[PDB]
Structure formats: structure tokens, C-alpha cells
Design an enzyme around this catalytic site. Structure first.
Site, PDB file in Angstrom:
ATOM      1  N   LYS A  62      53.165  55.355  52.306  1.00 20.97           N
ATOM      2  CA  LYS A  62      51.939  56.081  52.003  1.00 20.97           C
ATOM      3  C   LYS A  62      51.090  56.272  53.254  1.00 20.97           C
ATOM      4  CE  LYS A  62      51.899  54.901  47.128  1.00 20.97           C
ATOM      5  NZ  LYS A  62      52.907  53.798  47.140  1.00 20.97           N
ATOM      6  N   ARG A 136      22.592  45.645  44.562  1.00 22.92           N
ATOM      7  CA  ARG A 136      22.509  44.368  45.257  1.00 22.92           C
ATOM      8  C   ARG A 136      21.063  44.118  45.656  1.00 22.92           C
ATOM      9  NH1 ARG A 136      27.348  42.376  46.507  1.00 22.92           N
ATOM     10  NH2 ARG A 136      26.563  41.105  48.256  1.00 22.92           N
ATOM     11  N   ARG A 170      27.109  32.767  52.553  1.00 24.01           N
ATOM     12  CA  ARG A 170      27.882  33.391  53.623  1.00 24.01           C
ATOM     13  C   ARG A 170      27.028  34.262  54.535  1.00 24.01           C
ATOM     14  NH1 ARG A 170      30.978  35.051  49.339  1.00 24.01           N
ATOM     15  NH2 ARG A 170      31.022  37.233  50.025  1.00 24.01           N
ATOM     16  N   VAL A 178      22.889  35.693  42.330  1.00 19.82           N
ATOM     17  CA  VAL A 178      22.614  34.391  42.919  1.00 19.82           C
ATOM     18  C   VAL A 178      23.462  33.359  42.202  1.00 19.82           C
ATOM     19  CG1 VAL A 178      20.871  32.751  43.641  1.00 19.82           C
ATOM     20  CG2 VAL A 178      20.250  35.196  43.359  1.00 19.82           C
TER      21      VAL A 178
END
Ligand SMILES: [Mn+2]
Ligand SMILES: [Mn+2]
Ligand SMILES: [Mn+2]
Ligand code: NA
Ligand code: NA
Length: 320
Positions: A62, A136, A170, A178
Site C-alpha cells: 500500500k 480536550r 505524561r 483526568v
DNA sequence: CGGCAGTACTG
DNA sequence: CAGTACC
DNA sequence: GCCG
């Protein structure tokens, strides 16, 4: 990065396989997409495609069609149902089976769902917050949410430790939700907290909806006070202190990092879960037939890495 | 051929 | 149980 | 889908 002209094409397929229920193919595409993004160069040949782990025969083919030809034949053959299935499975509590059922029954829009679908309690909440849950939040809002939970938990018992994990830990600039992890160094006082803590967070009007209420995990919805606030997903996990390091690691993730660590654990005859790292686990032909093994002591995330023979990685360095 | 993770809620 | 979700 |  250097191959986004390939990965942009592949992610459309990945998503189509995912919402249609082909989780294994979708996993294979996702891994190959991550490999192509992380690569140091544009891939320019078949045997270079095969060089990369995660790209095999069919994926290399592909990538070859994308090069020179500029496009991918298969993308023009994706069922017209996929965008609707994506729409439906972005309701929290509705997955591929529910989305396909709704589709089969004739529903094509969230208005159809609202007006005609039978919804679980979770799905009615997911639908009520449909736009909010696709947004977000800035990590500064994740901090406010963690501190709200922390203040409510530490009012009941000041010894309780509370840590926001997931993408927050992170170091990401934005967070989908959360993930609050709670333990107690005394190894016992963590138990039976949710009754009081959740009632406390309700008293504020902070908790707006409950999705899952278990003895050790809560999944729900909160909103901070004042104008301009959206509803936010909130997960709370309570764990015994002896499991804190493994829960810290698991719920910090990322999901792909955890997946990579489970695979490494397997090569060493071990297993890693959100609860523990275990040794001398018995496999028969990659399948854990017998041999659950023994739980190894892991007081720190560092011990998990060390017992796997790995150098420690800061949470920011686990954003895979 | 077959793993690719285990854990927990919901109904 | 199947389905969905947590990373 | 990949890979052992
Ligand atoms: Mn999260
Ligand atoms: Mn979460
Ligand atoms: Mn809202
Ligand atoms: Na390869
Ligand atoms: Na969903």
C-alpha cells in the site's frame, strides 16, 4: 512526520476497520502508522518499507501504491456506513456492536438516536455531552480537577495520596480526561472511600453524572464552577499501596507504551498488569496456559523497569 | 497457526 | 454472558 | 494487519 502523505491515507483505513469491529487489523494499521511517523526518513521503496517493524507485505504494497501513484485504490471502496458508525461510536458507552445495530435499524444521525433509539443510562449521558467529550481540556484545567478531587479526599483522610495520571502525567498540553489515582501508605485506609468521596464531590455540584460506580473504579463527569466551563470526563481509581507503582505505570500509559511493556514482559517469562509485575509465568505456545507466577515486589515505577532489565523512562518519555 | 492483556462494570 | 471501557 |  516525513511520511504523513502515506499515514494520512492509512489512518482513514485504520479508522474504518476500527468502527467496523475489525480490531486486529485496526491494531496492525495503528502500529504501522506509528512506525511510519517515527521514522527518520521518507520511505522510498518496497524493501525499505519491509525494513520497518510493523510494516509487512500488505502494508508495504500500500505504501508503494501511494508512492508514484499518489493515492490508494482501497480508500474508494470504504462502506458509506463508516462516517455514521464513527458518529455513533463517539457516544461514550456505544461501541462498534451498538453502532452497527443502530445503523442496521435505520438510524443515521444523532437526531435519529435522540428521538428513536433505546439508550443505556451511560449512552444517554454520552449523548448529552457529545460535543464536550470530543474536546480536550487544557492541562491547567486537568490540574484544577485533580486538586478538587484531592481536597475532597484529603478532607476525609489526610493521608490519602492522589495523583493525576494519563496524558496529564505524561506532560501533554491538553487532556482528554483526568485519571485520578488514590492510595494510602498504610495499606488499608484506601478502602471504602468512594461512598464519602463521591457524595462530597456531589455536594459541590462538581460531579454531574456517573457512568460507572464500582468498589475500586469510578468513571463519570464533572464540571468546574463559573462561566465558560465544559463537562469533563473524570476517572478515579483506588488501589492498595502495594499496587501503587504498577497502577501509576498502567494508568500513566500511554496505551501503546503499556502494550510494548507487556510484550517485553512476555519475552522474559513475566507478566505486567495494572496490579502487579509477575515472574515465572508459564506459556505453552504464547498462551498463558498454567503458571500465573509470583508477584514481584515493586515499590516504585523504577523497580518495574529494573526487574524488566530496562532503563527508567520518565512519564513524558512514555507518550507512545 | 494463532497471540496481539488483564481488569471492571453494566444489564 | 456480550459489550464497552480503562492505559 | 504484523510477526514468530
Ligand atoms: Mn486519560
Ligand atoms: Mn481515563
Ligand atoms: Mn457541557
Ligand atoms: Na517489518
Ligand atoms: Na463510544
Amino acid at each position: 512526520n516525513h511520511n504523513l502523505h502515506i499515514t494520512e491515507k492509512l489512518e482513514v483505513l485504520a479508522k474504518a476497520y476500527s468502527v467496523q469491529g475489525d480490531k486486529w487489523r485496526a491494531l496492525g494499521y495503528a502500529k504501522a502508522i506509528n512506525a511510519l511517523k517515527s521514522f527518520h526518513k521518507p520511505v522510498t521503496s518496497y524493501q525499505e518499507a519491509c525494513s520497518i517493524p510493523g510494516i509487512g507485505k500488505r502494508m508495504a504494497e500500500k505504501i508503494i501504491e501511494i508512492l508514484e501513484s499518489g493515492h490508494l485504490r482501497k480508500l474508494d471502496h470504504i462502506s458509506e456506513s463508516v462516517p455514521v458508525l464513527e458518529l455513533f461510536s463517539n457516544i461514550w458507552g456505544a461501541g462498534t456492536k451498538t453502532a452497527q445495530m443502530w445503523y442496521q435499524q435505520g438510524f443515521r444521525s444523532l437526531e435519529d438516536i435522540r428521538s428513536q433509539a433505546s439508550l443505556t443510562t451511560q449512552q444517554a449521558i454520552g449523548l448529552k455531552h457529545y460535543s464536550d467529550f470530543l474536546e480536550r481540556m487544557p492541562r491547567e484545567e486537568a490540574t484544577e480537577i485533580e486538586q478538587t478531587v484531592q481536597k475532597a479526599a484529603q478532607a476525609f483522610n489526610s493521608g490519602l495520596l492522589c495523583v493525576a495520571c494519563g496524558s496529564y502525567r505524561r506532560g501533554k498540553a491538553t487532556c482528554g480526561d483526568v485519571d485520578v489515582l488514590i492510595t494510602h501508605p498504610d495499606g488499608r485506609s484506601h478502602r471504602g472511600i468512594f461512598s464519602r468521596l463521591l457524595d462530597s464531590l456531589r455536594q459541590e455540584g462538581f460531579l454531574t453524572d456517573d457512568l460507572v460506580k464500582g468498589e475500586t473504579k469510578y468513571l463519570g463527569v464533572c464540571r468546574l464552577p463559573g462561566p465558560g466551563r465544559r463537562h469533563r470526563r473524570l476517572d478515579i481509581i483506588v488501589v492498595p499501596y502495594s499496587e501503587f507503582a504498577c497502577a501509576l505505570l498502567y494508568f500513566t500509559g500511554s496505551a501503546h507504551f503499556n502494550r510494548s511493556m507487556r510484550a517485553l514482559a512476555k519475552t522474559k517469562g513475566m507478566s505486567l498488569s495494572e496490579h502487579a509485575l509477575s515472574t515465572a509465568v508459564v506459556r505453552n505456545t504464547h498462551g498463558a496456559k498454567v503458571g500465573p507466577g509470583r508477584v514481584l515486589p515493586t515499590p516504585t515505577e523504577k523497580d518495574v523497569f529494573r526487574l524488566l532489565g530496562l532503563p527508567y523512562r520518565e512519564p513524558a518519555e512514555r507518550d507512545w
